[model samples]
Target: GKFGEHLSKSLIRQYSYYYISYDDLKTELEDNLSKNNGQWTQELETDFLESLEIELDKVYTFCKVKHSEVFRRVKEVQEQVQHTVRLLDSNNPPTQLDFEILEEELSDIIADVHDLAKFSRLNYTGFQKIIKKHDKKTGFILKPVFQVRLDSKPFFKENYDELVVKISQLYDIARTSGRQNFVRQTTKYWVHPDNITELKLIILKHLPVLVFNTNKEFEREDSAITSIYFDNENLDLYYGRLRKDEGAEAHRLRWYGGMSTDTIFVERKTHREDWTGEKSVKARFALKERHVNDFLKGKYTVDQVFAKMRKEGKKPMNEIENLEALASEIQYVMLKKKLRPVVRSFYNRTAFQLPGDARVRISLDTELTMVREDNFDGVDRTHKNWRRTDIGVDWPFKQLDDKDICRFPYAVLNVKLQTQLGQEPPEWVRELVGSHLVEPVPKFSKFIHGVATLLNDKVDSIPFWLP
Candidate 1:
């Protein structure tokens, strides 16, 4: 029989909007292959590959849609499950009918999850590993459903190159090149409003204000700066800066706008102890926001980005060397060092810089808040006990039963100056610091303080001044 004639009868067709199961598709594929009597000529191989490609796309599309539906439902159902558990843990438990309703709903959702796993071709064992029944003793539990995997190259051997090109164009790899450069000395201090108002009036005479706002009219004076700091379970990156260790480094993913931006910056801030005193260096790679999750999951690497940029010849000869070198260093740290996001810090910043000199800058950060990376809903109980009590060092602060938001009281005043080797702050800036109105905190690292404060119980070491 001809290939086209065989496919018409052997391939299963489900034209409904709902997803088709993988088993049904597999059965049809096997039946179609059997029609060829387990033998294939060159022409037959080409036809088979073509048909297989189409079938794989159908499976992928169905799985993609179904996975999204299941993901959404799972989150909603999990919330219900948590509520039920809370009732069960309370002093006066709910009635038996309430328990029955909760159990029935959970059973239905669990069965639906099983169907989703099978259709999506996810390993049943892996699915079970993440999905577990909550203990009655514990108030609540959070479980993760598998995210949809877009890469299906294994089933499209003949069309793999085509898929690559399609994805490259879809993501626009050409514009992903280049690294942002920043060279300066940054100092953070806690200042009073009276001092800040006086200093702002003085600096305005010599510097120009750079207001960052989405509105064209510039009515808003402050811009939001958000960053997610990455570290290992052992707090390697956090302590590296805290101990002021030589060659200590920190990694963070930063985005300028609100939580909905599409561009992310992968930055590595390195500190080196040299003859010319402590030097700070920052290397950054701009990537599509969609790639952030994949990069965190270890599905993407910096080497791949560098290779793509090199192929396009977007980076110059001198910059290419530095780019590749930095990429390799980042790859090693991410792959071998095993760093992951630890905390997310956010604040509103008002900035000013010298227009002509471009070396001196000042910024004030207000309404500082820190959140744990794992708690998306910000409802965890860890953030309430950040500051210690004065009665006793180990005394717990007032625990709030609400969300897990941690807000600091003082505003951070940042003074920055970029100069040649062996240079000091300008005389005018010196007088401002010499005044006793403001307090200088040379080792004020938001990342370190946030981790130490929120994860105090989980952390290995706590500083004396943390309280």
Candidate 2:
């Protein structure tokens, strides 16, 4: 009930000597009163004050020493966690046994932070109680004197926010193994801007923000992704993709960063029905910007374009053959079907993953935008180009007409879970997916939504995911 007994009872008992001598100080105060019969004098004051000064110095010094040690200890633990992360980042990552040690270290750091906060709280309360007692009986107002001392030695102002975030992230990494390359089950969710931070906090507990550049800090432009989809005057690809028909195919030119990037990805995604027992496939091969027009124009064949890879060599003979045939097939399809750029999709994607693991990959796409690249209305949007030259990666494309642009209202949260035969997904993963922070929608396609919204007259039906 008494603050002194309660303070001692609550503080870590093992480090008793480091704490203030509250009982001793109180006993000394009573001794002065009892000996002088309630007459408090200058001699009594000097005796008690000198001893109190010693104890105060002792406590402050202890707190200062402990604070430094804890600071350095947290620093060391951080490096250790980062070391484990780097190991996971390597080509040959560590095993579960290696993570067990990391898990123990993570546990230790959590406890250490907890102990330091308690240390400050216990010591802080001790001073308050002892000073109150001295003033009550001695007619000496030492509160102001002590107040300045407390201000100068303010050890209780520690902030735990950054420490907890770092430790929580490490704990998540230690608990969950990296993503693997098994069969992948992909799902899409709509995340409102208000819940974006909440969703990210939950995700960061399991996966670190995936960074492509280790040397540079993360920026909106770093995660930028733009895709230019191909279709024809008949809207053949759009119809097939929207209808979810068997062998439904989509061809798109993809690039990362801004429009100035030299590399481009010529990608094809083929849809397969459930009855076929074969999942859909999305494949791509890279080509240079200068070669894009030529490839689309049939100026150079797949063989000549990938002639460099051919000289560099292939994945067995089959690898180069597959890539070459893949490129050739796309080019052949483009020429034969008269496929050209129709819809362009853009997003700044922030991915979450454990390096060297593909077991669980999460990406949050903010500021999703879709643009039209068709000359069907005779506006000459692309002017016979591979992609529209007018609009860069700048979102909203305000100057463009509504008929030519559709800015999505919410962020797209894409989750990919690849599990082994008998293992279930992480419980947190399931919990997060089930939360209100996201709305799960099946078979959501950006290109289809663009065509439906931007070219409403052309679509016979609306997509289920449209808000």
Candidate 3:
């Protein structure tokens, strides 16, 4: 299809919706801050970050879902079929009639597979690239540096492209045969043949002939068997016409393949456990390198983004501050300009507890980690010797049950001093803080760094340079 204004319009609409949703959610965080739990400002902001992280995840899911629905599944099936056909055709016309028939079937399967593969591979690879870029830019994972690898230039490696190309070839083979076109015309234009016809054909074509013949043997002798003894020229003419018609149909085929992506979200929630205080928290995954790149490009934020439901409307369990009222009064009197977009409706939010529930449990706050492998550090000799431990030193820990616990046992067990003596703020803490002041990785930058590695930040922050 020619690139037209419609494509441009769709692009604009997609981007506008994206930006609006992003900004809307950001504003929502600000608005809901007051209504959220937490007495201190720090707690309130931190809660927002946690909530926002969830929202960001949702966005990522949405994007990926659209891609898969629109392209990925179909492309994969198409590629396999097409690739097999090419292999089958590699041996020129065989002397055996059985070989010819199988080859013809194989060719059709491959043509359909290849046609769908092209659209799917293109769509999914692009979507995956974008999602990874977003993760990289925002430090979606835990890493120590902001280096770009997954996003930006060379967005996908040669291997990835090659894999998709293989799929494309398969789809093309199927496309040429007229079978993919048949399905495409009948099945609402989806590129991928995940449905019955395509699926069944795939099984027969790719599966062993033994398996096929075994099933075929079940047929009765009276069952209708082929009895065509047509002239060679007529057979060629009919097949030529069939090929032309199928080719024409392929152009008109459109697909709604990935719409089922939303079903994944619903399924997750369907089997989703109840809010057992903390079990309701979403499980986080490690971020790929590309996620980092999008962040630096200003595509996303460093604050925690979530999709978990936090506080609802007015009947929130937590109390709201009079700050909103005060701001309103200021605006009424025109003492100063005021921010109006205060209470955001849809946001990346998290509730201390579901509404009406008295106890406030943080997400992923289920247990006190019983196993020593995940235990708090034990106090050590260095800890006792240290006058001040406020300067955050890494205190390694060993669980009581751990055998290694007995070995190093006391090494690096020092607990930092929680409080300083008569000294104003403790000398060690001051010294550490002062040293960092000169050339320290700022806390935000440090956080960015740590998350970058975990989330594929290299895809965003690092400049592209080959060694």
Candidate 4:
């Protein structure tokens, strides 16, 4: 039943199709297998495998159709652009009035193309497994393909530059419009608390100074961020980091500015290790403040939230769809891995950005503290209920005593920029690192450190650097 529920929920979330009739397929198969007291006959095994293959093929075909539709839209846009350009170059060109309309049309088209280009690069591997599964079933070689190639643009550099300029302008509008959030490439480093004064003096000379919370007094503008890191009983996600596993991942619920009726972000942070280095991918969704509790309690599924959003037409359809998919993924992980809120952490952050380049962001986090509930006195750890409230009160931060508190002595600095820029750190940043003014510790994870620190005995192992 659980397997069927998972597959059904996945199909509905991805394709928005709820017409599948395989809800009882797994149950029926299991019953048949149990007839022989867990011994499966050759005939029964073949039937089960074939049935599974058939279901997988259907899913693959559905995904392929969706992918092709995007390509078709891209082709339509290209044809329209070509037609309009030909008209502009004709013997009888458009009048000023017509030209003005065409200008707006072209601008909109450019933005659309930019969006398409970005979407094509992101999550392209999402369909690979389906294609591979189908290929395996048919005993044939197959690979997924994207029909719209970003480089296929006739004037790649010029067009891309135009898109970038427009995006910059749009961001300026969105930043104050209170509707935009941008994710950039982030690099983290640990620096001694003593070195921070010198580092700040050096950084202020070149970077634009800003505080994270502008509403507060200028002298104390730092914001408080709290997060509840989730993990299974075995601490699979935690140990994955210590072992330097290839695809180490962790999920957490994070909220900024001291947890009011504000937006809460549920995020999954992943690291893929290879010879070159480690690559990070973050998948996150902003849950409504009112609906957050319901979501954590499993009272409202992602599918239901998505449908409600669609019916209301509250947000851009594409954005809403993406959020829905993200929510489904988070729910999937929590259910499959038996993930529960394990440890809570608190920190204060001061942020900086470049005046000309919003992509460049620098942040310093300090006053770090973490705590976990005692197994004997805290929430019931053995209960499998999805409703976190049933375990105990939802306390996201600790009012820990002196002995229970775990604090890190150093402040962590993070430098973020757009990945495409491919720029090195500023000379001052380099100078500090090279001179040991600030230590360089790669792959610093706050979640891992916090959980391991609070539950040292329960954890299997830790990275050697931890004190």
What are the TM-scores, per candidate, against the unseen true structure? 0.51, 0.61, 0.20, 0.54
TM-score of 3: 0.20
Local accuracy of candidate 2 as per-residue lDDT tens digits, 1-467: 16575656667877788777888888888887998789888888888889978987787787777667756766665555544453332212356665776677668767877776787777677877788888887887788887787777475544567667767766776676632334668888989999988888888988988654343575566677788999888888888887788888888887777776766878788988786364677767768898899898799887788777667441357656777888888888889998878889998877788764677878888889989888877788988778887788777778898778888989989888778877889888888889889999887888888888887776677787665
Question: lDDT rank, highest first?
Answer: 2, 4, 1, 3
Candidate RMSDs in Å, in order, are 22.0, 17.0, 38.4, 25.0
Query: Candidate 1's residue-wise lDDT over 444-464, tens digit each?
Result: 877887888777776788664
lDDT of residue 103 for candidate 2: 73
Order of quality (TM-score): 2, 4, 1, 3
lDDT for 20 in candidate 4 is: 29
Q: Indicate the TM-score of model 2.
A: 0.61
Q: After superposition, how far is residue 78 of candidate 1 from its true place, in Å?
A: 44
Deviation (Å) of 457 in candidate 3: 80
Query: What are the per-residue Cα lDDT tens digits for candidate 4 across 65-157?
Result: 544554454444343332332222111222344334334544555565554443333223223433343344333333522223223421112
By summed lDDT, the worst window of 10 consecutive residues in model 2 runs over 84-93
| Global lDDT of each candidate | 0.54, 0.76, 0.25, 0.55
lDDT-best of 1 and 4: 4
Ten-residue stretch with the least lDDT total in model 3: 261-270
